[PDB]
């Protein structure tokens, strides 16, 4: 699979420059200039048949042309069959993603559907990554989604939501892989927020609360457009890491882990969470 | 009150040499020697009352004395109240900020105008922070803005632009406070490439110097809506950090820091900015 | 079974702060190592071209200096450890007898009435458990359809654990580097029971448990060499996926290390 | 020395967040174990009267159930590990020859031209260092006045480390339980170099390093039994005090475990 990487190709008078994340080149071949402009207008992935045709049209040797495009950082060739064949975004704010399916193709991210949480008969295919993004958090919403889709062969989930001044992206919940669920995450953060200087969340005060029906909303700051835009980019990049065009590789020890962003300072914290003792996600 | 800037005096026999961040001055009045000697050991803060007492005691006219101290860069007279009444954003993508002035009210950020860099005849009020935001970077665009507005009373500048996978926000450049400028960073960086013990023939300086020679801007690389929304919020929060600030309530490291954001990892890198002795902002 | 201890007794002494802090740390070293993540992740923080300068070296107490007391090799009466096996080949049948020989010699006294093992343990607590994973259909079996067992070193017996198929275990245990690994006959998986490692000695017990794991695989290395098996200790696996595949409860027990066994041809 | 690696090369790849988080955790398991702290501290969170029910037991995958595949003891071809030595007695002289025999067999190839060791290591990085501590004036010595050495497993040589006296090392290494310990001839101290354990594999490397420590002392256990030495792996020591006594820099290197050697009479 050929992935078109980020670059610009600019001209003024008789001068043309290519600039990528990897290199810059003073381009002196009209054929390759045309090729580069054509790749620049395409979104994300290109069929090797089309690349070859583009090269032929500009009278350029295919191996030399391809070698140039790869080594300079314009494209790359990936061989691996990925884990989730597809992503869906389920949300209480689907409008926020109304251009995301089209835009994010340029980052190599395939999102087949934006789904409003309000919909009855929400269906999802096998080996699909379900991103559940909530502005108005309620634990019943997450429970409903798990209840519907936990049994889907090859499924995984990411949950994103707001807590105090933070945007939270849970680690990847994959029943196949045995990783912690949303509830394992939110309990880690809710206990860390208690001002009782203890990692251990458990006391008789907590035990008596566990007698009641597990349910809750979360306090958070009001969102403006900038907070949403910031959140939108973090979602794109995270999906890109997992399923899209990889630009920077993640170490194997943090790849599936949670990502938290403070919306005031804009600082990110990547952290693996343990299975919460009182959660039964790993029993299912 | 009065900020006392860093300086040195070196004394040899009866001779004394004063060196500030912008001046080198032979000091041959005993009074001014004693005024300077005292300010040296005063640790940065001093009240109008104490300065006037110190001057009167050293037999130095208060007005001529203060003017000398301000002009040579021994002291500056920054406000107790916030340094910048309002802010303006000047940009080659002003349409990005079309709702920013309304939106950012509720964050306590007050931007009075969004301004297209392509406008002829840009005016900016006194005591106004100028945010220069550029998707297409060229150093003469900064040069132009600086020349137009450096002499506006109470003015300051901050610049944001794209360098490959990074979004960079420069430190705040304030002529009044004597903080570093855009070029204190970038020209110094270019200098280090040009004057490398062994030049890297594949230096990114080759690109930037060739864009100068060819009269081209450095484009931001393949920005989409998400990268711009991310940039928009960083701009909002930096402005928020610079709002309400003085030398009284705030601290000079809030101005003398840059923020760089990797647009891929979304990781921020806050770094100190320092003056470059060779920079024209020091003349 | 005659030597059974219930974890209910152990938990009576658990400090929940210790347990949480140890788990939080432990999970930092877990991997997401899958063939499907190969091109978007990495393992080595050192470039492969610079690795060779770090491998099989000596750090010195006095760098730059050469004053040493040399010891003679003539005192060495040992055989050289065999190179660790890689691209294992399972063309031959492997008997349960061979696997039994490994287990009893590595982890048990020759005296079945004894409760002493061929490796020591802090507090004689023995917090590390050994699981057997059957990975080839050319590996002989005890109970048809059962491919994960738990070795009871004192009873000298295998307890049935899981009837997952042979390809699922292999996929979980071999992570992203399975083509280079080839096809081993079986694996041992060494597992920490957190509360058993922590209840008596607190944090220091974790350290003791991880060290104990190394004493155990080492006995397996040495025994493996004497009975004609190749082996490789192996860290390239997705911890949680191995756990799930083996039906382990990650709240209680975690895989510290895998060790592959077989032939090389 | 021919195999020397400078730690300056290693630090080039260090993630300072990883290094800080690992040290912060590691120190949680350090002890303050001194005779003078005996009556105001404790070690075991379990009362001595209830310890016996936890020692030398089996935890089961299916508690309450007895269905197992029994394996025969006839496959065991090994000798029983000797009980760990306690109240060691140093009345006899112990030769450097005996100590050399231990070192080369436990930690080195019989081939002095080889760089392969009798225990494996993640990335072939070998982050654990072995120090020799001379603890009795009845122990023969190589360099008069020197009681701490560093064993170079590939060069097969001892590097002089410290000229502290024999009573200071003994006091540091034996913690609060020295009367029960008695008087050993010598000790090995196994030490993690944090940045060597972390630079390539990050957090997982710590886990690998601690496990490696266990592979090493295990070889020492087995070798010790064959050459007529008693031994005991030992965790009852004040980590920082051992480090200081050996002139180790705790920012770089820490003692994971001590192992005592001698006679029992």
């Amino acid at each position: 699979m050929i992935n078109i990487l980020p670059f610009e190709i600019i001209s003024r008078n008789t001068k043309t420059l290519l600039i990528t994340y990897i290199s810059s080149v003073d381009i002196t071949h009209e054929g390759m200039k045309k090729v580069l402009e054509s790749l620049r207008s395409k979104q994300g992935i290109i069929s090797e048949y089309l690349l070859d045709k583009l090269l032929d049209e500009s009278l350029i040797d295919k191996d030399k042309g391809k070698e140039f495009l790869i080594t300079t950082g314009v494209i790359n060739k990936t061989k691996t069959s990925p884990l989730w064949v597809n992503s869906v975004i389920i949300s209480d704010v689907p409008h926020l993603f109304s251009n995301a399916r089209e835009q994010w193709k340029c980052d190599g991210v395939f999102v087949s559907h934006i789904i409003d949480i309000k919909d009855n008969n929400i269906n999802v295919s096998d080996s699909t990554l379900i991103w559940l993004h909530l502005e108005n958090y309620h634990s019943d919403i997450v429970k409903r989604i798990y209840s519907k889709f936990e049994s889907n062969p090859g499924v995984a989930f990411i949950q994103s939501y707001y807590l105090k001044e933070s945007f939270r992206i849970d680690g990847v919940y994959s029943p196949d892989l045995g990783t912690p669920c949303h509830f394992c995450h939110i309990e880690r953060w809710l206990s860390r927020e208690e001002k009782s200087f203890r990692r251990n969340e458990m006391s008789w005060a907590n035990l008596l609360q566990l007698l009641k029906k597990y349910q809750m909303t979360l306090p958070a700051l009001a969102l403006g457009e900038s907070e949403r835009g910031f959140s939108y980019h973090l979602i794109k990049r995270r999906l890109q890491e997992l399923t899209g065009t990889s630009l920077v590789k993640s170490h194997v020890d943090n790849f599936m882990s949670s990502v938290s962003a403070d919306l005031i300072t804009c600082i990110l914290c990547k952290e693996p969470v343990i299975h919460w003792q009182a959660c039964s996600c790993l029993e299912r | 009150m009065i900020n006392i800037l860093p300086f040195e005096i070196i004394s040899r026999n009866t001779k004394t040499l004063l060196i500030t961040y912008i001046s080198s001055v032979d000091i041959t009045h005993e009074g001014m020697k004693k005024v300077l000697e005292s300010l040296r050991s005063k640790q940065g803060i001093i009240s109008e009352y104490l300065l006037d007492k110190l001057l009167d005691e050293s037999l130095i006219d208060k007005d001529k004395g203060k003017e000398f101290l301000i002009t040579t860069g021994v002291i500056n007279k920054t406000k107790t109240s916030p340094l910048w009444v309002n802010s303006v954003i000047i940009s080659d993508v002003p349409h990005l900020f079309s709702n920013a002035r309304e939106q950012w009210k509720c964050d306590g950020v007050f931007v009075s105008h969004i301004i297209d860099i392509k406008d002829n005849n840009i005016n900016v009020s006194d005591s106004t922070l100028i945010w220069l935001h550029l998707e297409n970077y060229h150093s003469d665009i900064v040069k132009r803005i600086y020349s137009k507005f450096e002499s506006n009373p109470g003015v300051a500048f901050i610049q944001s632009y794209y360098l490959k996978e990074s979004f960079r926000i420069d430190g705040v450049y304030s002529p009044d406070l004597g903080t570093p400028c855009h070029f204190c960073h970038i020209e110094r960086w270019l200098s280090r490439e040009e004057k490398s013990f062994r030049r890297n023939e594949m230096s990114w300086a080759n690109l930037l110097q060739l864009l100068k020679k060819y009269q081209m801007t450095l484009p931001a690389l393949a920005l989409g809506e998400s990268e711009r929304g991310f940039s928009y919020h960083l701009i909002k929060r930096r402005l928020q950090e610079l709002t309400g600030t003085s030398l009284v309530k705030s601290h000079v490291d809030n101005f003398m820091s840059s923020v760089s954001a990797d647009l891929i990892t979304c990781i921020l890198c806050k770094e100190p900015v320092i003056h470059w002795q060779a920079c024209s902002c020091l003349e | 079974s005659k030597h059974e201890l219930s974890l209910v007794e152990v938990t009576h002494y658990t400090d929940p702060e210790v347990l949480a802090i140890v788990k939080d740390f432990h999970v930092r070293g877990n991997f997401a190592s899958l063939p499907e993540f190969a091109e978007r992740t990495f393992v080595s923080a050192v470039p492969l071209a610079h690795l060779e300068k770090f491998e099989n070296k000596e750090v010195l107490f006095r760098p730059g200096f050469s004053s040493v007391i040399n010891i003679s090799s003539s005192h060495n009466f040992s055989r050289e450890r065999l190179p660790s096996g890689i691209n294992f080949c399972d063309k031959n049948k492997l008997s349960i007898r061979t696997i039994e020989k490994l287990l009893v010699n590595a982890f048990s006294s020759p005296d079945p009435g004894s409760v002493r093992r061929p490796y020591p343990s802090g507090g004689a607590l023995y917090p590390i458990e050994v699981f057997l994973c059957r990975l080839s259909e050319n590996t002989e079996n005890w109970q048809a359809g059962t491919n994960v067992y738990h070795y009871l070193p004192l009873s000298q017996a295998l307890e049935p654990v899981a009837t997952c198929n042979t390809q699922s275990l292999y996929r979980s245990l071999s992570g992203g580097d399975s083509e280079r690994l080839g096809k081993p006959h079986f694996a041992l998986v060494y597992c920490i029971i957190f509360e058993k490692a922590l209840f008596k000695y607190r944090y220091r017990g974790y350290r003791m448990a991880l060290m104990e794991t190394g004493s155990m695989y080492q006995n397996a290395v040495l025994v493996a060499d004497q009975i004609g098996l190749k082996n490789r200790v192996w860290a390239g696996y997705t911890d949680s996926y191995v756990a799930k595949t083996m039906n382990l409860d990650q709240r209680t027990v975690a895989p510290l290390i895998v060790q592959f066994f077989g032939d090389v041809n | 020395s021919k195999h020397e690696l400078s730690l300056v090369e290693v630090t080039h790849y260090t993630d300072p967040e990883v290094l800080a988080i690992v040290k912060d955790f590691h120190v949680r398991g350090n002890f303050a174990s001194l005779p003078e702290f005996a009556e105001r501290t404790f070690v075991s969170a379990v009362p001595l009267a209830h310890l016996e029910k936890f020692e030398n037991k089996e935890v089961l995958f299916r508690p309450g159930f007895s269905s197992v595949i029994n394996i025969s003891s006839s496959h065991n071809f090994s000798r029983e590990r000797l009980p760990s030595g306690i109240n060691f007695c140093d009345k006899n002289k112990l030769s450097i020859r005996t100590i050399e025999k231990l070192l080369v067999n436990a930690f080195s190839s019989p081939d002095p031209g080889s760089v392969r060791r009798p225990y494996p290591s993640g990335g072939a990085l070998y982050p654990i260092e072995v120090f020799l501590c001379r603890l009795s004036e009845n122990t023969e010595n190589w360099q008069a006045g020197t009681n701490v050495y560093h064993y170079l497993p590939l060069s097969q040589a001892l590097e002089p480390v410290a000229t502290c006296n024999t009573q200071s090392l003994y006091r540091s290494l034996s913690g609060g339980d020295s009367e029960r310990l008695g008087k050993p001839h010598f000790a090995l101290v196994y030490c993690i170099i944090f940045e060597k354990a972390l630079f390539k594999y990050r957090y997982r490397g710590y886990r690998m390093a601690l496990m490696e420590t266990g592979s090493m002392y295990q070889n020492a256990v087995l070798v010790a039994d064959q050459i007529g030495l008693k031994n005991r792996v030992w965790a009852g020591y004040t980590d920082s005090y051992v480090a200081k006594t050996m002139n180790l820099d705790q920012r770089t290197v820490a003692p994971l475990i001590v192992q005592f050697f001698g006679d029992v009479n």
Binding site: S23 | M202 | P47 | -
Partner: peptide, 24 residues
């Protein structure tokens, strides 16, 4: 570097090396 299509002006060598699971 050198090709018929243009002249390489600059390279991010750290990133190029990546374009400071054994042994080597």
């Amino acid at each position: 570097k050198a090709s018929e299509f243009g002249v390489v002006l600059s390279v991010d060598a750290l990133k190029l090396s990546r374009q400071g699971g054994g042994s080597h």
